[PDB]
């Protein structure tokens, strides 16, 4: 009922921080917590919004239930120009609730076991044409491969078969629709997201008149995933439209190809950066997998602990998803303020991540932080790259076979570098932070 949050003046009268943040968000957060501590608003585009810094004022969020706190109210925006009508958040979370869980049929030990020699056989295969040595664009390449390790590993050989690396180009396009912009303005600017959905979508339903083309006297006997869709309903009974998959389908792939390809660059990075510990990662593939470095096991992987917190240090400092938000339909208290409905309701991972007061050498890359006591054992939400709650993400472990398997393999052909002590900066294009002229240097391994 009482008391806001503390308000950050702007000068600009309706558009607020938006132009300021948009540049900039992490460190515009990094000072809005020095000056106003974990919890403020601000205005942007005539819009207010309130951010919840480290743990105790996330617990908020991540504790909240969707109809106090409501996603698709903010992402409906972002993401149905995306996938399409009919599925996420452009649908009742009851809705998006029942699609969750049939897209998590395809992610568990069964199914990860086969996963491990696609991805190495996909990877090996992609890194053919960068021969014994040279100079690359390694996040361009690993956006390509992604697309074919998830197309296969998520979708099957039948789907992957049809796509190619062209196809990263369409991804990109539209991942480049989660931007500040897009956020925080109404859809008519130019976003050619729409015009790579089309393709998507165009691509994705060939597929189903193929197996449908079978599907009239052709019962597969053959596990599939598109099958899956096809062959399911919801509660009611009713069975989804040709749409409702198609759309299924371009999330699932974007889910696996989109994080997973920022993250697996910053990782390249890192290494490059950190020589010792790149070298200790080889050591470790030999130690885990044998000498002779025989072909990879979803078994191997849980023993690649020190490859293991290099992911997790990554995730820690430049997390895919820089922010998460929510509309605050009913009030909500924390720290002693009230947020009142109309308030957008966001968290940073980021900058939790790297709190001033949280994480000793905030800024560094060490993944050897988590051998002694961390905010991310030591409290609930100082360390969210996928998120907590009624929202999080069902694919933290296909993420990590597929990051840990491409980096296994790739550790295997080449030792990384950088090119003239250049590490890569962010670039806030988009809500998905991407490195600066990420190209790295490499030559043949052993
Ligand atoms: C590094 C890889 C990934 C990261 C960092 C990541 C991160 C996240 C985060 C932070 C959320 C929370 C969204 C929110 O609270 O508003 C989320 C949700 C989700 N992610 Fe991911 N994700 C990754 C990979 C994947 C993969 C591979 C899949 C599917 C196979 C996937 C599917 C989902 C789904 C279905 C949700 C649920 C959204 C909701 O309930 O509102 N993600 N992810
Ligand atoms: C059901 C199928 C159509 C899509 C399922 C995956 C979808 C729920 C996941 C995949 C992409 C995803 C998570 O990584 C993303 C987000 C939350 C949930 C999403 C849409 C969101 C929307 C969370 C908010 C972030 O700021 C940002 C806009 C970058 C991402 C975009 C990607």
């Not at 501590?37 to 942007?44: A, I, K, L, R």
């Not at 390790?149 to 690396?165: F, M, P, V």
Request: net charge positive; charged share 25%; with cysteine.
């Amino acid at each position: 009922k009482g008391k806001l949050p503390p308000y950050i003046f702007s000068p600009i009268p309706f558009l607020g921080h938006a132009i300021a943040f948009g540049k900039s968000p992490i460190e515009f957060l990094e000072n809005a917590y020095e000056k106003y501590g974990p919890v403020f608003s601000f205005t942007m585009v005539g819009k207010t919004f309130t951010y919840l810094l480290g743990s105790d004022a996330a617990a908020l969020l991540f504790n909240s239930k969707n109809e106090d706190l409501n996603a698709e109210d903010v992402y409906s925006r972002l993401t149905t120009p995306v996938f399409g009508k009919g599925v996420a958040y452009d649908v009742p979370n009851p809705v998006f609730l029942e699609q969750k869980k049939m897209l998590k049929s395809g992610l568990n030990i069964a199914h990860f076991k086969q996963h491990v020699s696609i991805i190495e056989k996909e990877t090996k295969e992609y890194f053919e044409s960068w021969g014994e040595s040279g100079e690359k664009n390694v996040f361009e390449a690993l956006s390509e491969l992604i697309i074919l390790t998830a197309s296969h590993c998520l979708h099957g050989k039948e789907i992957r078969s049809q796509l190619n690396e062209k196809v990263a180009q369409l991804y990109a396009d539209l991942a480049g629709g989660f931007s500040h912009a897009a956020w925080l303005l109404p859809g008519w600017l130019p976003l050619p997201s729409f015009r790579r959905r089309d393709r998507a979508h165009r691509e994705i339903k060939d597929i189903f008149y193929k197996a449908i083309q079978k599907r009239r006297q052709s019962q597969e006997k053959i596990d599939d995933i598109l099958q899956t869709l096809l062959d399911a309903t919801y509660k009611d009974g009713r069975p989804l439209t040709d749409d409702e998959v198609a759309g299924m389908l371009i999330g699932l792939l974007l889910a696996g190809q989109a994080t997973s390809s920022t993250t697996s660059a910053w990782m390249g990075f890192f290494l490059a950066r950190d020589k010792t510990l790149q070298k200790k990662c080889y050591l470790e593939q030999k130690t885990v997998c044998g000498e002779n470095l025989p072909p990879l096991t979803y078994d191997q992987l849980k023993d690649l602990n020190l490859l293991d917190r290099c992911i997790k240090e990554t995730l820690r400092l430049r997390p895919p998803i820089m922010i998460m938000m929510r509309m605050a339909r009913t009030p909500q208290t924390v720290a002693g303020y009230t947020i009142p409905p109309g308030h957008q309701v966001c968290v940073s991972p980021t900058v939790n991540q790297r709190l001033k007061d949280s994480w000793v050498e905030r800024l560094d890359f060490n993944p050897d932080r988590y051998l002694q006591d961390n905010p991310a054992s030591g409290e609930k939400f100082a360390y969210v790259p996928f998120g907590a709650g009624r929202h999080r993400c069902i694919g933290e472990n296909f993420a990590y076979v597929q990051i840990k398997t491409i980096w296994s393999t790739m550790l295997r052909l080449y030792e990384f570098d950088l090119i003239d002590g250049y590490f890569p900066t962010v670039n806030y294009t988009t809500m998905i932070h991407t490195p600066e002229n990420p190209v790295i240097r490499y030559k043949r391994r052993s």
